[PDB]
């Protein structure tokens, strides 16, 4: 692949997308629907199942869906601090790597 | 078994004994209360702006931060295949736009390796923090 | 009877040692778990909140400028900054401004770290913890693409002893009274009274290099304990006046969910001790006599050393 710092014309020039919309003969022109695996209910259930095991001895530690691995996890800025995470594989185990960074 | 919890070590009994002694601190100094509030986590970030608008802002932020990206074809317009500097030195990311609802969009960020089982997401986490902030500043 | 108790203790320990030799640090890791890391530019006060909010006493630090890990934030870091701030009350306006990297600078300036690979035997992880005289050890590996060393997790003496207890029923056969094992530390106990200023107790923590100071009364009866961990609640509120309180008063800051001090006697057995470690987060057992007078302390390092090396 070739790489450059030129923002694709489709996002800077109204003529490009117009061209696509007029030369129709469909889903390309709209971004895809959110996959079920990326919904927050599933992500926070995963978090709660870990908490239920470690604090209440209920159930068993959850295995994350492989499709969400290496994806950015975020939360609301609190006290000028951004907390981001990514669920990543370590050998056969799964670490949610969490970073606290100051912002402004 | 003669293994026990020392009753005088419990805060309720310690406070009560200090009160009985007459010490002023017993009434005045309150236990630490840590409000362990449950955070709602999400993948990526949400925007109410529309696809071309959102994609434009990301590319803009990407450009100012010093990233480079591949040319997207007509079949993958809502996917940014980017590379970023920060021994393999160039970090690869895939940014993907999704539609949640009619007026609601989710920006997805994915670590995709390095270019010239066991890995740290922290460099990726830090750069995305830069990117998210740059996106906030521009709005 | 005595010979039976003895050989059974010997069989149990030899079995536990084989277990420790056969498992790795990687094995102790839960199948899915979270790792909280703090950027070195984060404020100390905010970092303290992150610890307390997330129910942890430690976190690896990340230097974003150099893409390298920069050691661990622990209660010791907070102990050291308290003594600095107390001896220099003029600097108190800078608490609000102090960043984690700044904190590490202050400690380095005042002249005030072990690691292991997950693949190495758990036995070796325990030895290294005893050698470093710490209750925790970072698990380190190399990033497979960048070859930068990375923190996979941090293991504690507690987690290892609990891991042993959860997997080895042999612990039940450790029936020799601990007083017959010469594993209790009885000599030169650092202790205090309720009227001891808390700053002096905090000094004892650093000077003695212990995690806790037992509080006794005039007759030697054990009443309470002040722990390194307690210093975190001391800072959280209002550093200014809290540092000047007596230990009795500073203890009023303890959260109501404080689990309590654990005690035992010399007639107690490691089987019991291990059952307690299994069911609860206990970090030490203060040894008292028949009437509740302090005679010593049995810590996780004392228990681990016995298991690894004997009496
Ligand atoms: N208050 C104290 N006075 C004297 N010795 C102590 C005290 N507390 C702990 N010790 C001993 O010092 C060593 C290390 O103590 P500590 O740091 O509290 O335990 P650990 O290293 O297991 O966390 C152990 O041998 C323990 O028995």
Author numbering:
A (entry chain B): 303 to 327, 335 to 413
B (entry chain A): 465 to 550, 562 to 591, 608 to 630
C (entry chain C): 8 to 119, 124 to 322
What does the paper say about this structure?
The SNF1 protein kinase complex plays an essential role in regulating gene expression in response to the level of extracellular glucose in budding yeast. SNF1, like AMPK, is a heterotrimeric complex, consisting of a catalytic subunit (Snf1 in yeast; α in mammals) and two regulatory subunits (Sip1, Sip2, or Gal83 in yeast; β in mammals and Snf4 in yeast; γ in mammals) (Hardie, 2007; Hardie et al., 1998). SNF1 activity requires phosphorylation of a threonine residue in the activation loop (T-loop) of the kinase subunit (Thr210), and three protein kinases have been identified that phosphorylate and activate SNF1: Sak1, Elm1, and Tos3 (Hong et al., 2003; Sutherland et al., 2003). Using a tricistronic expression system, we expressed and purified a regulatory fragment of SNF1 from S. cerevisiae comprising the C-terminal domains of Snf1 (457–633) and Sip2 (304–415) together with full-length Snf4 (1–332).
Here we show that ADP is the long-sought metabolite that activates SNF1 in response to glucose limitation by protecting the enzyme against dephosphorylation by Glc7, its physiologically relevant protein phosphatase. We also show that the regulatory subunit of SNF1 has two ADP binding sites. First, we examined nucleotide binding using analogs of ADP and ATP carrying a coumarin fluorescent reporter group in competition assays. These experiments revealed two distinct nucleotide binding sites; AMP, ADP, and ATP bind with similar affinities at a tight site (Kd,I for ADP ∼80 μM) and at a weaker one (Kd,II for ADP ∼800 μM). In order to discover the location of the tight nucleotide binding site on SNF1, we carried out AXP and NADH crystal soaking experiments. Data sets from soaked crystals show strong, well-resolved electron density for AMP, ADP, and NADH at one of the four canonical nucleotide binding sites on Snf4 (labeled site 4 according to the convention suggested by Kemp [Kemp et al., 2007]). The tighter site binds AMP, ADP, and ATP competitively with NADH, whereas the weaker site does not bind NADH, but is responsible for mediating the protective effect of ADP on dephosphorylation. Two lines of evidence lead us to conclude that binding of ADP at the weaker of the two binding sites is responsible for protection of the enzyme against dephosphorylation. Second, the half-maximal effect of ADP on dephosphorylation of SNF1 occurred at a much higher concentration (>500 μM for recombinant SNF1) than the Kd for the tighter binding site (∼80 μM), but close to the Kd of the weaker site. Presumably reflecting the weak binding constant and the lattice packing, we have been unable to obtain crystals of SNF1 with nucleotide present in the weaker site. Given that the linker region is not conserved between mammals and yeast, and that ADP has been shown to bind to site 2 in the S. pombe homolog of AMPK (Jin et al., 2007), we think it is likely that ADP binding at site 2 in Snf4 mediates the protective effect against dephosphorylation of SNF1.
